[PDB]
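Lab meeting, action items carried over

1. Structure of the two-component assembly. Owner: GW. Status: complete.
Input record:
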Amino acid sequence: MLEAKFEEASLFKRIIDGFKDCVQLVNFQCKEDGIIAQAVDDSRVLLVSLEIGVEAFQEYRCDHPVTLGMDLTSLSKILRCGNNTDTLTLIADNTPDSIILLFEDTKKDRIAEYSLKLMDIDADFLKIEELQYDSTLSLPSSEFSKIVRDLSQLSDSINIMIT
Amino acid sequence: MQIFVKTLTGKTITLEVESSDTIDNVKSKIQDKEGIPPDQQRLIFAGKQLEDGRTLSDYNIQKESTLHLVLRLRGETIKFVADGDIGSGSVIIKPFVDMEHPETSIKLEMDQPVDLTFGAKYLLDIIKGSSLSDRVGIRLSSEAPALFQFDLKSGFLQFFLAPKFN
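Predicted assembly:
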């Protein structure tokens, strides 16, 4: 019986960007300790994995695990109704057929109820992270962003080297 | 009041205290919700490294400020290349720490040298996660898919991407 409220629909709008562009479908597993989500790209070379904790919502309540696999392309449409700083709220029932999305903003100003019809997607969660990796680096995300962006002009295959 | 405490992985943890609150207490707190003991911790505000005896107001600190926190390891060359028909590209980066604004710093721990290639269409998808975090963590290995990771305020978004064989 899920009711999960983002203080600003921008966030979730952003997160779904990550999946869009490289994965069609995704199961969402809602739990009493928040949401997590997994999707594998089509060529099984890329896995997108998402974890969102209770502390990330304005309010969160989900007294019972529920899975929602959803068409991302569908869901994003619904997310354009977003305006970016409205209060988004996901809601679901015991056995869910539709998840309801619910935006409103400053006061009773405006309110907009949407439903996304859910689909049966088979849950094959992967647990692929290793304990030890050869190397680890962090760097400004837009620096990285820039590099990948430039070298993509020259070549289909960027190659990384650490020493 | 509240301050911002920025670590060198895009993480911005929140933290509340009192001017009277010493430089030995702040850094102990931090360790108390992000795993790093304060030994591994350096803060610097206004390029001044803070000291474990002085006082937050000493360093003139007020509310809604932004402190830089650094990593002190008790313990060289990242290269990116793309090379093909029309020509070839090369960006070379080295681990450093910035002073004015350390959130730009490059951290690196290398356990073994790594030499790996990845499809660019995949990386192009991946960098979209910029919009969720200042910083990105990247983990490479010959024995497994490389991890790319943007952290959220409580949670994260991860991309596992397998290197190419040939």
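2. GW to write a short summary for the group page. Key points so far: Helices of chain A lie at 9-19, 72-80, 141-151. DSSP finds three helices and eleven strands in chain A.
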